[PDB]
Ligand binder design. Structure first.
Ligand SMILES: *[C@@H]1O[C@H](CO)[C@@H](O[C@@H]2O[C@H](CO)[C@@H](O)[C@H](O)[C@H]2NC(C)=O)[C@H](O)[C@H]1NC(C)=O
Ligand SMILES: *[C@@H]1O[C@H](CO)[C@@H](O[C@@H]2O[C@H](CO)[C@@H](O)[C@H](O)[C@H]2NC(C)=O)[C@H](O)[C@H]1NC(C)=O
Ligand SMILES: *[C@@H]1O[C@H](CO)[C@@H](O[C@@H]2O[C@H](CO)[C@@H](O)[C@H](O)[C@H]2NC(C)=O)[C@H](O)[C@H]1NC(C)=O
Ligand SMILES: *[C@@H]1O[C@H](CO)[C@@H](O[C@@H]2O[C@H](CO)[C@@H](O)[C@H](O)[C@H]2NC(C)=O)[C@H](O)[C@H]1NC(C)=O
Ligand SMILES: *[C@@H]1O[C@H](CO)[C@@H](O[C@@H]2O[C@H](CO)[C@@H](O)[C@H](O)[C@H]2NC(C)=O)[C@H](O)[C@H]1NC(C)=O
Ligand SMILES: *[C@@H]1O[C@H](CO)[C@@H](O)[C@H](O)[C@H]1NC(C)=O
Ligand SMILES: *[C@@H]1O[C@H](CO)[C@@H](O)[C@H](O)[C@H]1NC(C)=O
Ligand SMILES: *[C@@H]1O[C@H](CO)[C@@H](O)[C@H](O)[C@H]1NC(C)=O
Ligand SMILES: *[C@@H]1O[C@H](CO)[C@@H](O)[C@H](O)[C@H]1NC(C)=O
Ligand SMILES: *[C@@H]1O[C@H](CO)[C@@H](O)[C@H](O)[C@H]1NC(C)=O
Ligand SMILES: *[C@@H]1O[C@H](CO)[C@@H](O)[C@H](O)[C@H]1NC(C)=O
Ligand SMILES: *[C@@H]1O[C@H](CO)[C@@H](O)[C@H](O)[C@H]1NC(C)=O
Ligand SMILES: *[C@@H]1O[C@H](CO)[C@@H](O)[C@H](O)[C@H]1NC(C)=O
Ligand SMILES: *[C@@H]1O[C@H](CO)[C@@H](O)[C@H](O)[C@H]1NC(C)=O
Ligand SMILES: *[C@@H]1O[C@H](CO)[C@@H](O)[C@H](O)[C@H]1NC(C)=O
Ligand SMILES: *[C@@H]1O[C@H](CO)[C@@H](O)[C@H](O)[C@H]1NC(C)=O
Ligand SMILES: *[C@@H]1O[C@H](CO)[C@@H](O)[C@H](O)[C@H]1NC(C)=O
Lengths: 212, 419, 433, 149
């Protein structure tokens, strides 16, 4: 089930305030007008490839998407990143083991940590073993496909966990819809406003006008 | 494929002439740059910026930094020279005359507006609407404020209206404006009665052409493309010079305090010398571009100063120097970084064909026209001034004689009357 | 005089280069961190891992006094890249990573940027732009045994490099032959954990040496590993040398209203240079400038006529001039050019030492935006709005004309340059000679 | 002080040459700016590195002088083209061009030579001693309008 990103998937590239400037940068972005895969809560959460990094988003009002699994092979044999919102907390670990095997909340782990009215956007990438998480939450009222418009994801976390991740899966709540797409090395032009905030972008490689 | 223009066969023969039966006045607008922004640069504050460790390395390069600051100072001074040479051509501030009875002409658009805070004219105020720094770089104000410039354009204009040429050659002499235009018509070879017999019509053409200029300037800012280039080019050059501070030039950082904090002097000097070399070459590139660009703007300022003297302070015989058609008069209006001339010109407007011959036989004498041309309407012959059809009977005064009928090619027979 | 390299200065205006002393003072700001870093374990444990499979530790949130290691010059080498080792107690970091192992002493060569060899290839790679340090020492007495310490291992074969800061453990037959070895060992088909035969009697190069590599993470994220530096009080609104977590500068620290997002640690100028910071103790956002900069230009009669002089501070208001020059730390004969009654606000900047005048005159020395100055009566430098020449009013009316009855035959000089000095330069005799 | 233009054309060339000479004393990061010092203190493999800094700096200085002289030579030529025009139009003629051949109405001009330059003595008519009069554009006689020749 295909659809498209249009203009989604921008994030703050570095931890600096800049104001009233057209800064430009090269990074692993979701390309403008790139295709993406749609899903909804049935069976629609098999294992998926992670590639260079994932754009992930869900349209919800009650948190039906609860978490994610990531790894080489997700197998009880080598370290797998686990992420779980458990309502009281957001919970993170790197275990191999399927000590809970369920692909949902029921209606040697070198690192652990704990913290359609809504659209949650998440970006997952990994540079030199430093895993990086970005997100945005926004209210919406929306069709079956991503809102054609602009907002920039802030970083949530950096984790030095070093895993050779190539595959991933998402955890639901069972006894809503979501989207998946992939980052590419791209050069972007970014519009920082008077208040330190990114408000627009251009993907230079998109077309002859964007090169201009 | 672009077209060069519409094709036209001129209807030539050995004996046909076309004479204009009527004219039109026009007010073509011309725009010139005069002075670019007066920048100045504190080159040690750019290159090193408040580090003693870097400054003592920059001293090893000797007088590079001072001869660059001198070169920019020379550019910055000559912007005031350009502005002085173009506007200060009148030695006195002639104030605007009290009563505006200029024979039907209406200068209220171009004379200063007392209700504007800076007393620009109405058109000067449109021109000021259509045209739109930190790291040791600086910008300096011009010596003459836009209000002082508006006093000079007002003085030049009030002198031009009340006194014509005369305020350029000597003290201003008052003259009625319908007399000044009669002499300017005589200067383009049109007999002065052609003004007096048509004065209200001429004034309505002038007033209408003034009206069209407000509309023209109000329609798009792209009318000021020359002056907007002067601003954009200088802003683009400064952004380039500043943004080069972020470049590495092959050093381990473009931020000088990184090297100074992470490295000992003997290691740091090798890095800092790359940044000094790179920044100094980048500053030399900016100053060299500004020197070459200053010559272009100065060539424009001298051309503007020439049109000021030859066309505002007088009337020009020089073909197409001050508007197309035969030049009558010009009015200057100020604008950001430049000047604008409203060139008032005469253009012939309603051609009619006539038969013609270079001389006329009478008593075997050949007669030639004293002024103007022989023409015929097919049944009679006349003499006319060259630039406006005004047929007069051929007579012993409006002609002169030489030789006899045999010599001239294309001569014809017609009785010259004797008053 | 020093700007022009001359004892005489002609009448005019001059943009002085800065010679003022402004001796300044220093301010220091750091996190409240006190946990001592575990270097006394990392440099001192009973064994370090095999060079095939080196030990690693992320270090965070601690006081890193490297001076113990700097004084312990018994280390056979202590080499740093991108940092001079002296700076490590004054500089500080977001993260540090320590890698450690034992290797043959001859073969320690491989542990640097730009190196080659079977360990540099197959089982430990630094990035060639590595920032940090390698420390190593002889450990023959500890790490040599039997003539057979075959625990200290390297890849015999396989293909492609191990990448910068990758780890590999993998245990397989390596297929060196044209043979489809495909799980079966033989000649050119072999398992690959070959290793040193360290005798305690080995000659110097054949002995084991211990190694530690420190990698330092200088990111714009918050610092956590920092040297034994002590924070001062925070001075504001004075020219100071300053240091925030090792981010140095010299300038005026001030309070600020820059609307940083919670994660934004620094603010940056168009030059891509820091111009605002978050205090690591106070969490206040501070602004930065250089030491209260403003363009000092001198207005003077000729020194041939008077030594009396006036100053234009380009681009500042007269309320702030003493804080521009830092009159607190300046020569008294200079200090007089703040306040002093003869202080006047031009559109170009504050003018001090000039007597303002309400009349208008022709422009003797240009100052800017219609202001000029001259030397006049008992003498002083005076400053005034310039004359545009006399007002006049033509007696225009619709039936009146003026006609000249007489003339004067002027002779007007005009001067033009036409040529300049012809020259040539023999480049070899100029450059070399 | 009247001959300021010509005196300045002399001063700029002396100032340029003095600047070009003074830069021979600058180190550009070498151990000395005097080339015989490098050649006498150091062996060739090391001396070459220091000499190449001096070559790099001195060559950059000499290219700066020639670039500045090319730009200044065009500025003098722009003035020579104007003087060549005033010679042909004002001396060899009489000029209708307002304020070209001096202020007032032009009569005549005389060239005089000067160092690096030329001087024109423009002779010009300037009117004086005005009177007011009443005036009219035309005159009526026999009901015809007469206009002045
Ligand atoms: C000469 O040309 C002008 C226009 O350039 C003519 O003036 C117009 O005359 C008509 C009446 O015939 C009026 O409706 C217009 O308003 C006039 N125009 C203007 C601008 O006033 C003029 O009639 C022509 N004269 C001859 C002899 O052909
Ligand atoms: C001179 O021209 C101006 C416009 O350039 C005329 O002023 C406008 O006249 C209209 C009526 O025709 C009024 O509605 C506007 O309010 C006037 N504007 C201004 C700024 O006055 C003016 O009437 C003309 N005057 C003469 C004597 O011809
Ligand atoms: C050529 O010009 C003459 C003079 O204007 C014209 O002759 C006059 O024509 C009018 C009528 O248009 C008569 O009332 C006059 O009596 C004529 N005068 C003379 C001296 O003949 C003549 O008609 C014009 N020819 C053409 C072909 O237009
Ligand atoms: C102009 O008038 C003269 C007479 O005044 C004409 O000249 C005569 O022309 C005929 C025919 O060519 C000759 O036979 C006569 O000998 C000429 N007489 C004289 C005194 O020269 C002349 O032809 C007329 N021209 C035109 C074009 O009509
Ligand atoms: C990620 O997994 C791959 C295998 O899926 C590992 O690949 C080996 O990498 C070493 C260098 O460390 C190469 O010499 C080998 O040739 C690779 N194996 C094969 C079969 O070619 C890789 O080590 C892992 N990378 C990271 C960063 O963990
Ligand atoms: C997106 O996917 C469809 C098939 O689902 C494909 O036809 C289309 O070409 C893709 N979009 C782009 C921009 O190529
Ligand atoms: C720990 O994880 C590694 C893979 O990263 C695995 O080889 C090892 O056997 C695991 N050890 C234990 C005790 O689970
Ligand atoms: C969520 O997880 C944390 C630890 O990860 C735990 O303290 C908390 O009790 C959990 N809450 C629920 C509802 O399971
Ligand atoms: C910036 O933030 C202020 C409130 O702090 C607000 O008034 C202003 O409108 C904002 N400007 C923009 C461009 O968002
Ligand atoms: C002049 O007359 C000829 C007659 O053939 C005609 O072709 C031409 O267009 C006319 N020109 C004008 C200006 O009337
Ligand atoms: C003009 O041309 C005609 C033929 O078109 C010729 O007969 C006549 O002689 C020519 N006249 C002149 C003056 O050249
Ligand atoms: C930092 O330490 C000082 C004492 O050195 C203490 O007064 C201050 O409250 C501390 N601040 C924080 C945020 O830890
Ligand atoms: C290593 O430990 C010994 C005591 O066992 C101590 O004397 C020595 O100073 C330590 N060295 C380092 C570098 O910590
Ligand atoms: C300059 O000083 C000299 C003596 O050193 C004197 O002769 C001359 O008149 C002075 N000129 C001016 C302009 O003060
Ligand atoms: C000068 O600065 C003061 C504050 O120091 C301010 O109140 C005043 O308005 C400023 N005046 C001008 C003309 O900028
Ligand atoms: C200058 O004029 C102002 C009023 O415009 C007045 O307040 C001031 O006292 C005058 N000063 C002198 C010296 O006349
Ligand atoms: C000309 O006459 C007017 C009449 O008011 C007078 O004001 C003016 O001064 C006179 N000008 C000359 C130069 O005589």
């Amino acid at each position: 089930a295909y659809t498209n990103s249009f203009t989604r998937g921008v994030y703050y590239p570095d931890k600096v305030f800049r104001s009233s400037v057209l800064h430009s940068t090269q990074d692993l972005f979701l390309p403008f007008f790139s295709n993406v895969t749609w899903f909804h809560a049935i069976h629609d959460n098999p294992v998926l490839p992670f590639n260079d990094g994932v754009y992930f988003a869900s349209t919800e009002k009650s948190n039906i998407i609860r978490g994610w699994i990531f790894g080489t092979t997700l197998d009880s044999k080598t370290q797998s990143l686990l992420i779980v919102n458990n309502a009281t907390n957001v919970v993170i670990k790197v275990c191999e083991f399927q000590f809970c095997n369920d692909p949902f909340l029921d209606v040697n782990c070198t690192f652990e940590y704990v913290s359609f009215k809504n659209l949650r956007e998440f970006v997952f990438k990994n540079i030199d073993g430093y895993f990086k998480i970005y997100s945005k939450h926004t209210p919406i009222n929306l069709v079956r496909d991503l809102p054609q418009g602009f907002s920039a994801l802030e970083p949530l976390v950096d984790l030095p966990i070093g895993i050779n991740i190539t595959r991933f899966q998402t955890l639901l709540a069972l006894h809503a819809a979501y989207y998946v797409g992939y980052l590419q090395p791209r050069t972007f032009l970014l519009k920082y406003n008077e208040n330190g905030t990114i408000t627009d972008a251009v993907d230079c490689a998109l077309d002859p006008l964007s090169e201009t | 494929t672009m077209s060069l223009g519409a094709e036209n066969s001129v209807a030539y023969s050995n004996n046909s002439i076309a004479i204009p039966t009527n004219f039109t006045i026009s007010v073509t607008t011309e725009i010139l740059p005069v002075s670019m922004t007066k920048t100045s640069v504190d080159c040690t504050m750019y290159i090193c910026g408040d580090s003693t460790e870097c400054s003592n390395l920059l001293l090893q390069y000797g007088s590079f930094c001072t001869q660059l600051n001198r070169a920019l100072t020379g550019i910055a001074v000559e912007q005031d020279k350009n502005t002085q040479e173009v506007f200060a051509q009148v030695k006195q501030i002639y104030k605007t005359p009290p009563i505006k009875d200029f024979g039907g002409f209406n200068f209220s658009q171009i004379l200063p507006d007392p209700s504007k805070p800076s007393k620009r004219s109405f058109i000067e105020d449109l021109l000021f609407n259509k045209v739109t720094k930190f790291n040791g770089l600086t910008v300096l104000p011009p010596l003459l404020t836009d209000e002082m410039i508006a006093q000079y354009t007002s003085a030049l204009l009030a002198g031009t209206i009340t006194s014509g040429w005369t305020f350029g050659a000597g003290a201003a002499l008052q003259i009625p404006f319908a007399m000044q235009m009669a002499y300017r018509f005589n200067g383009i070879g049109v007999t002065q009665n052609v003004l007096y017999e048509n004065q209200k019509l001429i004034a309505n053409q002038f007033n209408s052409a003034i009206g069209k200029i407000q509309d023209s300037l109000s329609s798009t800012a792209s009318a000021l493309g020359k002056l907007q280039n002067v601003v954009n080019q200088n802003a683009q050059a400064l952004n380039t010079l500043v943004k080069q501070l972020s470049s590495n030039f092959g050093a381990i950082s473009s931020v000088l305090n990184d090297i100074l904090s992470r490295l000992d002097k003997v290691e740091a000097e090798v890095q800092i010398d790359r940044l000094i070399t790179g920044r100094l070459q980048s500053l030399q590139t900016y100053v060299t571009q500004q020197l070459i660009r200053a010559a272009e703007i100065r060539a424009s300022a001298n051309l503007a100063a020439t049109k000021m003297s030859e066309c505002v302070l007088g009337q020009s015989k020089r073909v197409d120097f001050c508007g197309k058609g035969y030049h009558l008069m010009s009015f200057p209006q100020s604008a950001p970084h430049g000047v604008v001339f409203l060139h008032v010109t005469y253009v012939p407007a309603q051609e009619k064909n006539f038969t013609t011959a270079p001389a006329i036989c009478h008593d075997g004498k050949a007669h030639f026209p004293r002024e103007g041309v022989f023409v015929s309407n097919g049944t009679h012959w006349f003499v006319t001034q060259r630039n406006f059809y005004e047929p007069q009977i051929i007579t012993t005064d409006n002609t002169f004689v030489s030789g006899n009928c045999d010599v001239v090619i294309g001569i014809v027979n017609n009785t010259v009357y004797d008053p | 005089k020093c700007t022009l390299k001359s004892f005489t200065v002609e009448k005019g205006i001059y943009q002085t280069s800065n010679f003022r002393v402004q001796p300044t003072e220093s301010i220091v700001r750091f996190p409240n961190i006190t946990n001592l870093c575990p270097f006394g374990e990392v440099f001192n444990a009973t064994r370090f891992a095999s060079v095939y499979a080196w030990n690693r530790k992320r270090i965070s949130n601690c006081v890193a006094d490297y001076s113990v290691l700097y004084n312990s010059a018994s280390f056979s080498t202590f080499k740093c890249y991108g940092v001079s080792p002296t700076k490590l107690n004054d500089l500080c970091f977001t993260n540090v990573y320590a890698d450690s192992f034992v290797i043959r002493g001859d073969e320690v060569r491989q542990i640097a940027p730009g190196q080659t060899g079977k360990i540099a290839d197959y089982n430990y790679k630094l990035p060639d732009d590595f920032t940090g340090c390698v420390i190593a020492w002889n450990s023959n007495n500890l790490d040599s045994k039997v003539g057979g310490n075959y625990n200290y291992r390297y890849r015999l074969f396989r293909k492609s490099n191990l990448k910068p800061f990758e780890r590999d453990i993998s245990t397989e037959i390596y297929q060196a032959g044209s043979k489809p070895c495909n799980g079966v060992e033989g000649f050119n088909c072999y398992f690959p954990l070959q290793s040193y035969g360290f005798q305690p009697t080995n000659g110097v190069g054949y002995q084991p040496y211990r190694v530690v590599v420190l990698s330092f993470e200088l990111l714009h994220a918050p610092a956590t590993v920092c040297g034994p530096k002590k924070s001062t009080n925070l001075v504001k609104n004075k020219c100071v040398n300053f240091n925030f977590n090792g981010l140095t500068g010299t300038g005026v620290l001030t309070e600020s209203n820059k609307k940083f997002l919670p994660f934004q640690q620094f603010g940056r100028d168009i030059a891509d240079t820091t111009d605002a910071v978050r205090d690591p103790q106070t969490l206040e956002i501070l602004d930065i400038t250089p030491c209260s900069f403003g363009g000092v230009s001198v207005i003077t009669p000729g020194t041939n006529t008077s030594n009396q002089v006036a100053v234009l501070y380009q681009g500042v208001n007269c309320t702030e001039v003493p804080v521009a020059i830092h009159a607190d730390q300046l020569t008294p004969t200079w200090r007089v050019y703040s306040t002093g009654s003869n202080v006047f606000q031009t559109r170009a900047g504050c003018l001090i030492g000039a007597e303002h005048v309400n009349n208008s005159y022709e422009c003797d020395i240009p100052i800017g935006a219609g202001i000029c100055a001259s030397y006049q009566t008992s003498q002083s430098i005076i400053a005034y709005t310039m004359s545009l020449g006399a007002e006049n009013s033509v007696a225009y009316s619709n039936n009146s004309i003026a006609i000249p009855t007489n003339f004067t035959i002027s002779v007007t000089t005009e001067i033009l340059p036409v040529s300049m000095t012809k020259t040539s330069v023999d480049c070899t005799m100029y450059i070399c000679g």
